[PDB]
Structures are given as structure tokens and as C-alpha cells.
Amino acid sequence: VDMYIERAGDITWEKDAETTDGVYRVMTRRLLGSTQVGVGVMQEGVFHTMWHVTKGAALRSGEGRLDPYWGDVKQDLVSYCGPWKLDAAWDGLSEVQLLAVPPGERARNIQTLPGIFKTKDGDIGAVALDYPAGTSGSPILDKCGRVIGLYGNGVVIK
Amino acid sequence: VDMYIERAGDITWEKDAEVTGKGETTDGVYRVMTRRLLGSTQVGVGVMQEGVFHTMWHVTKGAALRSGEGRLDPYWGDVKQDLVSYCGPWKLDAAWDGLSEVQLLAVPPGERARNIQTLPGIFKDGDIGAVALDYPAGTSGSPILDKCGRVIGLYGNGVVIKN
């Protein structure tokens, strides 16, 4: 019962909607087959995903193995091979694109204006879209194609 | 790490279902939920029986659960077998005869409980049976029942053969 990752596609802004950079599916092997538990972003030799998806478990890309470097359960984030590199943020005004990677389906971008929330430590943005269980961790992009958040977690405001 | 559990239904053998070609510790099937910043998410499923909650080790990773106002502490756990018990020893002692059909009382995320008859395949320490069915991530730990309604295995893990 060891987790692994397969590449799902490139991280680009669709203008009209190893450790290679891109979006990957976080898969887990049961007895008779596999199941997608989440999604993650590989960037600058560091894999990023949500903590609940992997629960700090070691991943596997090809013959090699990726060990977890940092993790925060409160924020529900985890990083592999290095520190958290997704430093981009949402301006809290313009539309964003959810590069959703649902289980057993191709990657697809979707423009949408995320809502606003009244959480404790300031306000946070969120994508009001519905997707299957293992879609968590899918990247949320800005006009520049930079990852400003992960589906499931809120999109940090500037 | 604030996991909790909500009841999903009773553990019964639906006599004519689909066929394939503490605060509260009431017996039944429960969803193992984790509460994030913007909502919750189902990470697995478990069986409450004889005042003991049973689930898969990978689902909770030995973490403490919460049922109502009360809290459930883990009593036993084996990562190799991928099993964990809360409040007491493992009580699911039933086994599959390795011949008759069984029912997977699946509890998928954001969906009602549903039974499914199916004849599990066989494998070769000893031999083990397995349910060749596909379900979303958080469905792991769903109980596998026999004609009598006794839990003979958990979805994800194999169904132990009469040994």
C-alpha cells in the first residue's frame, strides 16, 4: 500500500475556457487496482499538495521516491523535496482558472470568480465548484499562469 | 488534527440490492471525516461494534477520533495489515467461507449508503478474497458483509478466507 504520482498535464492558462514541472495525480494502490486521492503541483523540483491527501506519506515518481520536507496540518499543506515554493497570491478581484484533474478524466481549465469568506485570520477566497473526492489539490491559476491556491484549500488574498 | 465521525447507517444485509455479474458509540457504519478551513472531507469509513470503532490504519494514521462531545482514543493498530481499533481490541472476528456471495456496504463521499452483492475473487501468507469494485478515495474501510450481516472484511483490505 504505497502512494505514487502520474503526470496529468502542463500548468497553463487556457486563453479560451521524474520531477518534471506540471500537475500530477496523487494515486494510492489498493488490493485490486488504484484510486486517485488528490492532485498536486510540481514546481522548481518540489511537489506540492494538501496534507489530508497524503498524510505526510512518502510518494513515488517512476523508480525514484520523494520524501516529505515540510507539512502544516492547520493550513492543510505539505511539500516534498524542498520548502513551499508557491508564493503567488490572488488580487481578490480578477477571475481565476481551476485546472481540475478529476479521477479517470482529462485535465480541464475553468474560469470562475471565487467567493469571499469571513474566516478568523483575515478574509480568504474560495472556488465555489463541485468535483469528485480525489480532485482536491488541483491548482488554481491567475492570468499569468502562476499557482495562487489549491482546490479544497482557500485562495489567499493579496 | 481534528478528525471526527458521523453515522451513515445500520449494518444490514439488503436482501434484494444491486448484484454484479465518549459522546456516542452506537453500532453501525460511520464516515471518517477531517475538518479543514473551508468545510470537511471524508477520508474513510469505519464499523462501530461492541463499543469499539474499527477502520483502516492509513485513514486515520493512529490519530484520535471524535464522536459527539466525546473523544475516541486508539487502542490497537497494525500498519502492515492496515488496521486500527479504538476503545478496545479488534472485535470483527467473522470470516468468509470462500464460496458464497458477499455485500459491500459502500459509503462513498457525499452519497447515501448502498449495498452491492458480488462474488469476490481469490488470491495466493495464505490465500485471501478481494472485491473487484471501484469507489472514490474516502470509501476505504467500508464493511463487507456475509448473508448473516456480520462484517467479514473492510473495503481496501481483502476478505479473509475461512482459515
Side-chain angles (χ1 to χ4, degrees):
Chain A
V1 185
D2 55 329
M3 298 198 181
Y4 70 102
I5 60 179
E6 295 180 353
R7 198 177 189 277
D10 302 353
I11 300 178
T12 62
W13 171 272
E14 186 67 14
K15 192 173 180 180
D16 55 3
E18 65 189 3
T19 69
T20 307
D21 296 359
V23 56
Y24 292 74
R25 305 175 185 275
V26 180
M27 306 290 293
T28 58
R29 268 277 293 178
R30 58 165 169 264
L31 199 174
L32 288 175
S34 61
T35 175
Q36 179 173 328
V37 293
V39 176
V41 177
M42 185 70 71
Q43 196 194 244
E44 306 178 35
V46 177
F47 182 74
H48 310 97
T49 183
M50 290 204 292
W51 175 268
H52 78 259
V53 172
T54 190
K55 291 159 286 192
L59 299 174
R60 184 171 189 175
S61 184
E63 182 179 3
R65 184 155 180 166
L66 291 60
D67 298 350
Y69 186 89
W70 171 87
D72 189 7
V73 189
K74 299 180 295 183
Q75 296 187 346
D76 188 26
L77 296 174
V78 60
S79 78
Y80 291 73
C81 311
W84 189 267
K85 311 292 185 179
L86 307 180
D87 60 350
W90 179 53
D91 58 354
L93 290 171
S94 301
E95 298 184 4
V96 299
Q97 285 181 195
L98 165 53
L99 193 179
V101 182
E105 297 184 2
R106 297 72 171 88
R108 67 283 298 278
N109 297 39
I110 299 189
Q111 288 188 18
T112 186
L113 184 56
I116 189 66
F117 276 85
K118 308 174 185 302
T119 60
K120 183 197 301 179
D121 187 14
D123 54 350
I124 190 173
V127 178
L129 295 176
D130 186 12
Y131 278 93
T135 308
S136 298
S138 295
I140 304 298
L141 313 182
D142 64 3
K143 295 173 181 175
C144 306
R146 308 183 189 278
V147 182
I148 53 174
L150 301 177
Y151 180 76
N153 205 217
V155 46
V156 58
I157 312 179
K158 193 60 166 285
Chain B
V1 184
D2 298 339
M3 296 190 181
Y4 70 101
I5 59 179
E6 64 177 10
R7 199 176 189 277
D10 301 354
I11 299 178
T12 181
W13 171 272
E14 294 294 344
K15 300 179 180 180
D16 196 355
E18 183 182 5
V19 185
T20 60
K22 299 75 66 176
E24 179 177 352
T25 180
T26 307
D27 296 0
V29 56
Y30 292 75
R31 305 175 185 275
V32 180
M33 305 291 291
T34 182
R35 204 163 192 173
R36 306 167 300 179
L37 189 52
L38 296 172
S40 59
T41 176
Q42 180 173 328
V43 294
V45 176
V47 177
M48 185 69 72
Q49 193 182 122
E50 304 172 29
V52 177
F53 182 74
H54 310 97
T55 182
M56 317 281 292
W57 174 267
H58 77 258
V59 172
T60 65
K61 295 285 191 171
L65 298 174
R66 182 179 59 186
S67 185
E69 180 64 10
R71 187 204 315 269
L72 306 173
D73 298 347
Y75 187 94
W76 172 86
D78 190 5
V79 69
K80 211 165 191 298
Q81 295 180 2
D82 190 26
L83 296 172
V84 60
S85 182
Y86 292 77
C87 311
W90 189 267
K91 293 189 174 301
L92 306 180
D93 60 349
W96 178 54
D97 58 354
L99 196 174
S100 60
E101 296 180 359
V102 299
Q103 284 181 14
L104 166 52
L105 193 172
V107 182
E111 297 182 8
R112 299 71 171 179
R114 47 213 276 358
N115 295 42
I116 297 188
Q117 287 189 20
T118 185
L119 189 173
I122 302 179
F123 274 86
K124 269 64 178 179
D125 299 342
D127 55 346
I128 195 172
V131 174
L133 296 175
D134 186 11
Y135 278 92
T139 309
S140 300
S142 295
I144 304 179
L145 313 181
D146 64 3
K147 267 74 174 182
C148 302
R150 308 180 188 278
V151 181
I152 54 174
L154 302 178
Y155 181 75
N157 277 358
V159 170
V160 59
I161 312 301
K162 191 62 62 176
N163 184 13

